[PDB]
């Protein structure tokens, strides 16, 4: 499990640290797209739909509006397949 957590987590935290310009090292599990990652509104919908793509998931809306820290979007992931 752990051994795939971390696979998982590195994962998007991959696609985060592209996305943003941001370095890895800022992509922990409990900084925030917006507060700590100069992420904005839209910069965060062009996220949601990369990895909803990627992963082949639908994160429904009432979850996606909830998603403030990229700790958030590692357990929406898992709560869709």
Not at 12 to 29: M, R
Not at 51 to 68: N, R, S, Y
Request: hydrophobic share 50%; aromatic share 6%.
């Amino acid at each position: 499990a752990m051994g795939y957590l971390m696979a998982l987590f590195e994962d998007i935290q991959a696609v985060i640290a592209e996305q943003l310009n941001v370095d890895a090292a800022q992509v922990t599990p409990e900084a925030e797209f917006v507060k700590d990652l100069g992420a904005d509104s839209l910069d965060v919908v062009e996220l949601i739909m990369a990895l909803e793509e990627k992963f082949g998931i639908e994160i429904p809306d009432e979850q996606a509006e909830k998603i403030v820290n990229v700790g958030d979007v590692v357990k929406y992931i898992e709560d869709n397949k």
